[PDB]
Design a protein around this ligand. Structure first.
Ligand code: BCL
Ligand SMILES: CCCCCCCCCCCCCCCCCC(=O)OC[C@H](CO)OC(=O)CCCCCCCCCCCCCCCCC
Ligand SMILES: COC(C)(C)CCC/C(C)=C/C=C/C(C)=C/C=C/C(C)=C/C=C/C=C(C)/C=C/C=C(C)/C=C/C=C(\C)CCCC(C)(C)OC
Ligand SMILES: [Ca+2]
Lengths: 84, 44
C-alpha cells in the first residue's frame, strides 16, 4: 500500500558507501559458494561426460584373497593402496 | 642426512598418515645384497 512511501528516508541514517561495499562483497562471496556447492553434487556440469569424455578413464586393480592388491615377487618395495 | 627426493608408498585412507618411505640410496644397499641363487636342473 501507501505505507512504504517514506522508505527513501532509510538513507538519512544508513550510509551509502559501507552499504554498497557490503552488498558487492557479499554477492561475489555467494556466487562462488553456490557454484562450488552445485559442482560438488550430481548436477556437476564440468565432469559429467556430456557431451563426451575428454580425459582417459580410471582403471581398477585386481585384489587378492585378503582384499588388497597382490604383491609382485621381486619388487624391492611393497604395493600401494588407498583404502585399507 | 638423507637428501631428497624419496619414494613413498601409500598404504591406507587419505589424510591419515599411513605410508612407507624409502631412500633410493639406502634401498640400493638392500638390493645389492640379495642375489637369488641359480637353478639346479630337475632330476631324471
Ligand atoms: C542448476 C541451477 C541451480 C542454481 C545455480 C545457481 C548459481 C551458479 C548461482 C545461483 C545464484 C542464485 N540463485 Mg540459483 N540455482 C538453483 C536453484 C535456486 C533456487 C531454488 C528454489 O531452487 C533459488 C531460490 C535460487 C536463488 C538464487 C539466488 C539466491 C542467487 C541469485 C543472486 C541473488 O542475489 O538473488 C536474489 C534474487 C532472488 C532471490 C530472486 C531469484 C530466485 C530465482 C528466480 C530462483 C527461482 C527458482 C525456483 C524454481 C522458483 C519456484 C517458484 C515458482 C513455482 C515458479 N537458486 C539450482 C539448484 N544459482 C547466483 C548467485 O548467488 O549470485 C550472487 C549464482 O551464481
Ligand atoms: C640440540 C641440537 C639441535 C640441532 C638442530 C638440528 C640440526 C639437524 C641436522 C641438519 C643437517 C642436515 O641438513 O641434515 C642432517 C640430517 C637431518 O641428519 C644427518 O645426516 C646428520 C648426520 C650428522 C650430523 C650431525 C651434526 C650435528 C650438529 C648440530 C649442531 C650441534 C649439536
Ligand atoms: C528519518 O526517518 C525516520 C528514522 C524517522 C523514519 C525511518 C523509516 C524507515 C526507513 C524504517 C525502515 C524500517 C525497516 C526497513 C525495517 C525492516 C524490518 C524487518 C525486515 C524485520 C524482520 C525481523 C525478523 C526477525 C526478528 C526474525 C527472527 C527469527 C528468529 C529469532 C529465529 C530463530 C530460529 C531458530 C533459533 C531455529 C534454529 C533452527 C536450527 C534447526 C538450524 O537450529 C539448530
Ligand atoms: Ca559437461
Amino acid at each position: 500500500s501507501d505505507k512504504f512511501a517514506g522508505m527513501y528516508k532509510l538513507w538519512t541514517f544508513i550510509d551509502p558507501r559501507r552499504t554498497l561495499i557490503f552488498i558487492v562483497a557479499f554477492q561475489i562471496m555467494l556466487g562462488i559458494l553456490i557454484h562450488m556447492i552445485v559442482l560438488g553434487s550430481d548436477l556437476n556440469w564440468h565432469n559429467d561426460g556430456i557431451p563426451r569424455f575428454y580425459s582417459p578413464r580410471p582403471v581398477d586393480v585386481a585384489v587378492g584373497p585378503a582384499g588388497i592388491p597382490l604383491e609382485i615377487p621381486g619388487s624391492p618395495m611393497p604395493q600401494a593402496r588407498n583404502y585399507n | 642426512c638423507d637428501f631428497p627426493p624419496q619414494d613413498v608408498v601409500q598404504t591406507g585412507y587419505r589424510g591419515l598418515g599411513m605410508q612407507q618411505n624409502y631412500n633410493p640410496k639406502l634401498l640400493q644397499k638392500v638390493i645389492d645384497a640379495t642375489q637369488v641363487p641359480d637353478a639346479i636342473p630337475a632330476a631324471t
